[PDB]
Every structure is written in C-alpha cells, then in structure tokens.
Amino acid sequence: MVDAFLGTWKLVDSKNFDDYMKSLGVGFATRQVASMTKPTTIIEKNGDILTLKTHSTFKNTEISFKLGVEFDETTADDRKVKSIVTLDGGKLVHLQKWDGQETTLVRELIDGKLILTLTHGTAVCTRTYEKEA
Numbered sequence: 001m002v003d004a005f006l007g008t009w010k011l012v013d014s015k016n017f018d019d020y021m022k023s024l025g026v027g028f029a030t031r032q033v034a035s036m037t038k039p040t041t042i043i044e045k046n047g048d049i050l051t052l053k054t055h056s057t058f059k060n061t062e063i064s065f066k067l068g069v070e071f072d073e074t075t076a077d078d079r080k081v082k083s084i085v086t087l088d089g090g091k092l093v094h095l096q097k098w099d100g101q102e103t104t105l106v107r108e109l110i111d112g113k114l115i116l117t118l119t120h121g122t123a124v125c126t127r128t129y130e131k132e133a
C-alpha cells in the first residue's frame with residue numbers, strides 16, 4: 001500500500017511555498033529562511049506504524065501514525081492540530097484540523113519523484129522530492 005513512499009527524499013523544487021506559509025500566518029523571517037531550505041524527508045514503516053521525519057538546517061519534525069487513525073500533531077510552525085493520514089487514489093493524504101481551519105498535505109509519486117501538494121485557504125504549493133539511494 002504505502003511502500004513506494006518509503007525511504008529518504010530530498011527537496012529538488014518548490015513552487016508557492018511562501019504563499020502557503022503566509023496563508024498559515026508564518027512570519028516573514030521564518031518564511032525567508034524556509035524559502036532557502038532544502039529539507040530531507042524520511043518515511044519509514046514498522047508494521048502498521050509510519051514515521052515521517054523532516055530534517056533541515058532550520059527546523060526538524062517527526063510524526064508517527066497509523067493510517068486512518070487520528071493523532072495529535074504539533075507542526076513545524078507550532079500549530080497544535082488534529083491529524084489523519086490515509087491512502088486515497090494511491091496518494092498519501094494528510095489532513096490537519098485546528099481552530100475550524102484545515103490544511104491538506106498530499107503526496108504522490110509521479111515518474112519516481114514524490115510530489116507534495118500543500119493547500120491552505122486558496123494557497124496551493126507544490127514541492128518535488130527525489131529519492132536518495
């Protein structure tokens with residue numbers, strides 16, 4: 001099910017991440033650093049538990065979850081959200097809810113690259129990651 005997503009991924013392109021961050025209320029100085037950061041995302045499974053690590057020179061995060069089971073998450077920008085991750089159409093769909101707001105983080109594989117689409121409000125960001133050997 002999730003197996004083609006597993007591994008270590010490096011950011012190789014980013015479109016509209018500033019728009020997405022601004023929509024979430026991220027401050028200009030943080031957006032400024034984030035716009036020049038290239039994180040590494042590591043996705044691993046142990047049985048039904050997935051762990052997703054995002055590493056950078058600026059901020060690091062880690063979450064563990066079971067598909068289809070809600071979990072508490074504190075995001076990189078310090079939002080305390082209710083999260084759920086599912087597979088939908090072969091895409092890994094992560095929905096975050098807080099204060100009546102929502103954002104989606106949708107991952108899919110196209111030609112071997114991992115495409116992350118981030119939507120909040122009207123902002124739509126597309127980030128492309130390439131697999132590390």
Ligand SMILES: CCCCCCCCCCCCCCCCCCCC(=O)O
Binds near residue numbers: 033039127
């Ligand atoms: C956590 C590792 C850093 C990720 C690179 C961006 C650097 C920090 C930006 C922090 C403020 C904006 C955070 C809004 C959440 C987006 C999470 C997913 C982005 C991605 O994994 O590429």
